[PDB]
Ligand binder design. Structure first.
Ligand SMILES: Nc1ncnc2c1ncn2[C@@H]1O[C@H](COP(=O)(O)OP(=O)(O)OP(=O)(O)O)[C@@H](O)[C@H]1O
Ligand SMILES: O=c1[nH]c(=O)c2nc[nH]c2[nH]1
Ligand SMILES: O=c1[nH]c(=O)c2nc[nH]c2[nH]1
Ligand SMILES: [Ca+2]
Ligand SMILES: [Zn+2]
Lengths: 96, 184, 362, 145, 48
């Protein structure tokens, strides 16, 4: 059971994206879709670097999105994270 | 950042495509430093966010201790991650890793022999193979292909492949001998 | 007269390749026959002699006949699959290296070395006169020219790929063809590219199936030296049958985990040996007569040998073999010792290994 | 036919107790479990026979002196002086043995081929007793399941 | 729609090609990539 839990932990990364949770097949409809979504669109390292950038940047120079994320991070409200949505998912209607 | 934002927000524009083509080197250089994410914007829409990622941050993220912490974090959240607790755990890990990177920056300041043996063994084996494919003996063996029949050629073909098999068995065996000698 | 010999080897038609599977199963049947003959050997008496316990009066010469036939059939086997599948392997390797040259430019820019034996061997074949011998595209060299001439040095690429920079361009500029035929003397002799045959022989020697056939032939040869070497050929049925191949591959399927578990078993048995050496030494007498005591745990290496070989193989563990503890001062300590040994080694770790193998098969 | 032969010998009526296996559903499943993977079972048994034959070859060539199964010194009963006898002994005793052939053949301590025979017995126990027998048992159990 | 030659049919029904096809199918179903599936398919097609 411990072995199968480790195997499921490994597999679940390829099945769904960590940040959004959308299944990998929707991305894979476009070739290399998962390899682009996990590395560029929704990347854990990218989110952590964004948080560090917000901390290092002065509050006066914060942009609109930066200030929004700063407020909700200080308030511990994690609604800014895309829950079940992505850029292409949201723009399938108009862009696509 | 401006060019990337424009390209990703208006994909269907050849006028912008020309600018991207002429700026391909700028974007290629900035790719390691450009960080792109998606957030739930205040306008009830998903919005792209572009920012700067420092080389020091990249190096301290690639540092091994941060990697092990990331592995433990990922294993734990996939096992016992909560319904809403998932991203709270994610941001707690992000804060811990930011402190870890700060500490790592503070702390940090400022086989093939067998392959070559096989190469040489094959080299001299093939040298021998061509040397008796080209010897004066085989250059003179053309009288038998005059008194040629079928038995002479059967013998010649069997002898040739038999010598090829001899060269093969000299090889592999020589590799094993050299490997044993070098390891002990 | 010299339209002959070459076309004539071709009259051999690669018949070994045509009936390679038929010939392989003939070899397997001959191995069955030889190893069933071997079942009637017996020892007679100095130096013992292996003589056939035989009654029909026919089994002695047929042994030598079958050994010679098996050796000949296996040599024909190795000539086959070299007529048959070696060209396919060469074509696949040539295609892979050509695609790496063109799309990836591995030798133009990346220059992979020191880690990929395929990489260095393909580097060795890069500059051959006829590189795409089996590959369909005979113009890969000139395509690499057109792709990387202005970047990496036109002449540098020319000498890297080993082409003549002007041969074909003036060939297409002016026809100027001179007659040439292979029937001419020494033409066939000199029409062989040493570096290309180098690379072909190297890759086919690297090939796994060719190595297996080489081992089969070598043991078929050694069977004449000693007839019991023909027993190794019964293992060929394991590769012949699909389920037996799965059984064999089950061991390697979890090889890392199996090795680590065996190491853990060795470590825990070593700990038990340490404990027995320090405290329970007097219990390890394996002598029935009182005059000559045979201590198995007066030496560290001997104690480790005894614990492994006897305890791990034992149904209940080391306690079923070492002396009883009743009446001794360390009775409870030795009881705990034996119970824990049985629980951890026999019950858990051995079951862990067995379950690993069974689950890999499943 | 066996009911008829029961008059010839009353013990032939014992074969009719096998009828309950067909009468009951679960026993029918147990019987059909053997045939469910019959090809695979036969191939695995053949592999076991082949590996035991290899071990017999090795013991015949090298470890022959260890196969004395006689308590009295006057009459030695060698089980591996003949190839067929050695194969018989290895199958019948080693495969059935809990630890393998080494629990039954003479101890190797003090001999020149001590380490070689230790490897022989350990590999025999690991491959025959631990793996292949478990492979067959798991085949039957999984067919039933 | 296209033409399939009788020689192509016979050499496809030949046993070695069949074994290569079995190995190809087993491998791609096990460890086939997301986009690598049809690249492996065309590589097998060229080899065959
Ligand atoms: N948000 C995400 N960020 C990164 N990878 C993700 C994400 N969501 C899913 N993945 C998947 O995780 C895998 C990347 O590997 P993983 O997340 O285990 O570690 P890593 O950061 O790539 O480092 P390493 O390979 O050194 O362990 C890929 O299969 C990728 O598709
Ligand atoms: O992890 C963190 N490190 C910091 O330095 C910091 N400053 C504000 N918020 C912070 N979080
Ligand atoms: O596999 C292949 N064989 C060929 O002959 C060929 N010609 C072009 N492309 C080809 N591919
Ligand atoms: Ca401001
Ligand atoms: Zn995502």
């Amino acid at each position: 059971e411990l072995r199968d839990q480790q195997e499921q932990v490994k597999e679940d990364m390829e099945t769904k994206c960590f940040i959004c949770g959308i299944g990998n097949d929707y991305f894979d409809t476009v070739p290399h879709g998962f390899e682009t979504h996990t590395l560029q669109e929704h990347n854990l390292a990218n989110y952590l670097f964004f948080l560090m950038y917000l901390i290092n940047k002065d509050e006066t120079e914060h942009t609109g999105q930066e200030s929004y994320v700063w407020k909700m991070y200080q308030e511990r409200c994690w609604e800014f994270f895309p829950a079940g949505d992505c850029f292409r998912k949201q723009y399938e209607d108009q862009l696509n | 950042v401006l060019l990337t934002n424009l390209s990703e927000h208006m994909p269907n524009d050849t006028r912008l495509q020309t600018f991207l083509e002429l700026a391909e080197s700028v974007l290629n250089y900035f790719q390691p430093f450009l960080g792109r994410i998606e957030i739930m914007g205040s306008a009830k829409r998903i919005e792209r966010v572009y920012f700067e990622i420092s080389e020091s941050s990249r190096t301290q993220w690639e540092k091994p201790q941060v990697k092990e912490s990331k592995r433990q974090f990922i294993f734990d959240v996939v096992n016992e991650g909560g319904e809403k607790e998932k991203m709270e755990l994610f941001v707690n890990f992000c804060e811990d890793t930011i402190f870890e990177m700060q500490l790592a920056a503070q702390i940090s300041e400022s086989s093939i022999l067998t392959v070559r043996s096989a190469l040489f063994a094959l080299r001299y084996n093939i040298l021998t193979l061509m040397r008796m494919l080209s010897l004066k003996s085989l250059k003179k063996q053309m009288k038998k292909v005059k008194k040629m029949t079928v038995k002479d050629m059967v013998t010649a073909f069997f002898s040739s492949y038999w010598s090829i098999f001899m060269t093969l068995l000299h090889f592999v065996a020589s590799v094993f001998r050299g490997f044993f000698r070098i390891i002990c | 007269f010299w339209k002959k010999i070459i076309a004539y080897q071709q009259k051999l038609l690669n018949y070994f390749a045509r009936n390679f599977y038929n010939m392989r199963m003939l070899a397997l049947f001959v191995a069955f026959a030889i190893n069933f003959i071997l079942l009637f050997y017996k020892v007679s008496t100095i130096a013992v002699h292996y003589v056939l316990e035989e009654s029909s009066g026919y089994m002695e010469p047929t042994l030598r006949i079958l050994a010679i036939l098996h050796t000949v059939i296996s040599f024909f086997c190795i000539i086959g699959y070299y007529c048959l599948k070696v060209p396919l392997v060469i074509f696949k390797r040539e295609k892979e290296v050509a695609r790496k040259l063109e799309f990836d430019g591995l030798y133009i820019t990346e220059q992979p070395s020191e880690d990929d034996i395929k990489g260095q061997w393909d580097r060795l074949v890069i500059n051959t006169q006829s590189f795409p011998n089996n590959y369909w595209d005979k113009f890969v060299k000139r395509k690499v020219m057109d792709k990387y001439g202005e970047f990496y040095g036109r002449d540098r690429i020319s000498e890297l790929l080993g082409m003549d920079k002007a041969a074909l361009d003036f060939s297409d500029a002016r026809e100027k063809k001179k007659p040439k035929k292979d029937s001419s003397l020494s033409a066939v002799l000199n029409s062989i590219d040493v570096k290309y045959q180098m690379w072909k022989l190297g890759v086919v020697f690297t090939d796994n199936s060719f190595l297996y056939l080489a081992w089969y032939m070598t043991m078929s040869v050694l069977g004449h030296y000693n007839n019991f070497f023909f027993a190794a050929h019964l293992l060929d049925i394991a590769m012949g049958f699909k389920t037996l191949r799965t059984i064999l591959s089950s061991v390697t399927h979890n090889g890392k985990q199996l090795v680590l578990t065996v190491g853990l078993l060795a470590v825990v048995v070593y700990l038990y040996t340490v404990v027995a050496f320090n405290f329970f030494r007097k219990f390890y007498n394996k002598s029935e007569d009182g005059d000559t005591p045979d201590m198995k745990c007066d030496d560290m290496l001997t104690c480790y040998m005894f614990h492994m070989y006897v305890g791990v193989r034992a149904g209940g563990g080391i306690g079923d073999e070492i002396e009883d503890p009743a009446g001794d001062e360390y009775e409870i300590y030795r009881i705990i010792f034996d119970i824990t040994f049985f629980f951890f080694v026999i019950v858990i770790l051995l079951a862990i290994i067995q379950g690993l193998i069974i689950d890999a098969f499943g």
